């Protein structure tokens, strides 16, 4: 079993850190490639410009077409697919506009029906989509 003497501290602590490198969440935090491959670069939100509109096909038992957008981040230049949240809101997003994009909620894991799309647009032209969908504010250009 375990080494369980009284002078056995450095063996136990070496064992802890060595085996803790096999922890998936710990390694994802501390190998540091999961923060260098991360498109947001450890940011809660990014801001991008719309490159094109995309219809992503639904996954097998669900039959629909989900309205996504290929945007390009300002801060590094990467290409990211983002999901426009509510019904009838893709028309608010116009070609080449400033978009404030968030995560979708599973911390890098693709969420729900949309496959491989893990971000959602929160704001367009510095107006929130929730206000536009609820018909409270007006979108400038």
């Amino acid at each position: 079993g375990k080494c369980r003497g009284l002078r056995t501290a450095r063996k136990l602590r070496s064992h802890r850190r060595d085996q803790k490198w096999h922890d998936k969440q710990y390694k994802k935090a501390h190998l540091g490639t999961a923060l260098k491959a991360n498109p947001f670069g450890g940011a809660s939100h990014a801001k991008g410009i719309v490159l094109e509109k995309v219809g992503v096909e639904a996954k097998q038992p669900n039959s629909a077409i989900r309205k996504c957008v290929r945007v390009q981040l300002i801060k590094n230049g990467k290409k990211i697919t983002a999901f426009v949240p509510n019904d009838g809101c893709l028309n608010f997003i116009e070609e080449n506009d400033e978009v404030l994009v968030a995560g979708f909620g599973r911390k890098g894991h693709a969420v729900g029906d949309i496959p491989g799309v893990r971000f959602k647009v929160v704001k367009v032209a510095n107006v929130s989509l929730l206000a536009l969908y609820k018909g409270k504010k007006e979108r400038p250009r």
Partner: protein, 89 residues
């Protein structure tokens, strides 16, 4: 103009009125302009007062974007068998 849905398909059903929430496509013969372009819609209300109705952007210019006008004809089925019906009017 002619108002249509803003979908991704080929055919676009003609809209006979302007909807207050749906975003439509106004299609008309016009001098050709390269997108992007801000688009504004006005009407004479009374005594030359230009009233604003709708606004948007200019999408791609092409005559191939067909607009389809629909007409649905109603009928009241007054006799019903199993999977068979006799309909009048």
């Amino acid at each position: 103009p002619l108002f249509s849905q803003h979908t991704a398909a080929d055919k676009h059903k003609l809209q006979r009125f302007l909807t207050a929430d749906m975003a439509l496509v106004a299609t008309v013969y016009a001098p050709i302009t390269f997108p992007p372009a801000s688009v504004l819609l006005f009407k004479q209300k009374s005594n030359g007062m230009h009233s604003l109705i709708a606004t948007g952007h200019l999408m791609s210019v092409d005559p191939d974007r067909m607009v389809i006008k629909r007409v649905v004809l109603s009928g009241h089925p007054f006799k019903i068998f199993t999977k068979m019906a006799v309909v009048r009017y």
